[PDB]
């Protein structure tokens, strides 16, 4: 009955400090335990730590006091900082509530990703953070035409950007039928590229709207279907 | 760590079970949970308190425990159940939760589907900057594995090719993409370029000729 959203930079330099925010919506943090869990590419889940509603904390001993978790009840935000990062810290980071319940004949217990009292799902979305020396690079956006009586399929190429992610809409969100946006590839340049394709069978216009939050850039591209 | 089988399979509409083995200091004392995750996506809680379901989790998922082993049972398997499942439990001697290594569930019997392929040439604006990207988009294939070969004038190209892994679409089929990066000058150097996509012993080929665009 709850929403948690992770936010912060997707790229951190080696030996520097990774910081993230968990913004909680529709609860008071005075009444909720909130914790952090990460998943490295391909591998196990690892617990980072938790801040209880009473204000005390617990941390994973395996992170060697590199962790700090704080909260601001007034702003509905929980903060995480992890110092001296290496490539071992490249992972997807989740916030979640630690919700407690009575187990019949046993006592009280708690589970991460569960809201107390209502027992609804209470996981954040997850945010990938990559530890890397690479510089931020805004994408170049190119129109795609299959015109090389034809049935015409068109698109936008979002070329040579860093880091992930980017968002694509068409006609400021109005066009959705026949839209397929593909996951990105990493090219030998060391930069990402992805494509969005529109398949439609007139007065119709086609404009792709690309956003790259890491570079605070937005690009609108008109694409011509005709031949 | 809690011990799970790396993989299990069941058929559409049938039952499957996933075990999670631990010790008398974790599963023997504390309450087991279960999480579901589709690769590329986030985590969802399926079970808490050994046997309880969060709001909105359908009752064909059930959880049980005996001694130091917990079990997740899934009845009436659907395509959407294809995912990874992790068990979790508290421990007597720390605040650290203990996780299972995870189990990948495959749901058999799903309908086969050949890939749709679209091949885009480089745009005039890219060629103006002395670069040329060819884009091969691959959609609506099941099962989720293809191989891609690029050719120029019938000769296999190896350099400057990058191909994504297959990823699951909204409609539970799979998509992928392949990129050939050239200079403006190499684009015009050849008569024809081909993207050849092989899926379950069948091959779909698309071609573009620089002379016609």
Author numbering:
A (entry chain H): 1 to 148, 153 to 205, 210 to 235
B (entry chain L): 3 to 215
What does the paper say about this structure?
The H3s of B4 and B13 are of different lengths, comprising 21 and 25 residues respectively. Both contain a pair of cysteines, at positions cys97-cys100G (B4), and cys95-cys100E (B13) (Kabat numbering) and structures of the Fabs revealed that they form disulphide bridges irrespective of the paired LC. The N-terminal loop of the longer B13 H3 adopts an extended β-hairpin structure contacting L1 and L2, and a shorter C-terminal loop folded between the H1 and L2 loops. Therefore, in contrast to the H3 of B4, that of B13 protrudes from the surface of the variable regions. Viewed from the top, the antigen binding regions of the two Fabs show differences in both shape and electrostatic potential. Both Fabs have a negatively charged cavity surrounded by positively charged areas, but the B13 cavity is much bigger and the negatively charged area is broader, consistent with the fact that the two Fabs bind to different epitopes of the bRSV F protein. For the Fabs with more than one molecule in the AU superimposition showed that the 6 B13 Fabs differed by rmsds of 0.7–1.4 Å, the 2 B4* Fabs by only 0.3 Å and the 4 B13* Fabs by 0.5–2.3 Å based on Cα atoms. The large structural differences in B13 and B13* Fabs are mainly due to variations in the elbow angles between the variable and constant domains. Thus, superimposition of the variable domains of the 6 B13 and 4 B13* Fabs showed smaller conformational differences between the variable domains with rmsds of 0.4−0.6 Å and 0.8−0.9 Å respectively. The Kdapp obtained for the F protein/B4, B13 and B13* were 84 nM, 125 nM and 234 nM respectively.
We have investigated the role of the LC in the structure and activity of two neutralizing cattle antibodies (B4 and B13) that bind the F protein of bovine respiratory syncytial virus (bRSV). The F protein epitopes recognised by mAbs B4 and B13 are conserved in both human (h) and bovine (b) RSV, and are a major cause of lower respiratory tract infections in young children and calves, respectively. Both B4 and B13 are potent neutralizing, fusion-inhibiting antibodies and protect mice against hRSV infection and calves against bRSV infection. B4 recognises antigenic site II (residues 255–275), whereas B13 binds to an epitope contained within antigenic site IV, V, VI (residues 417–438). Exchanging the LCs between the Fab fragments produced hybrid Fabs: B13* (B13 HC/B4 LC) and B4* (B4 HC/B13 LC).
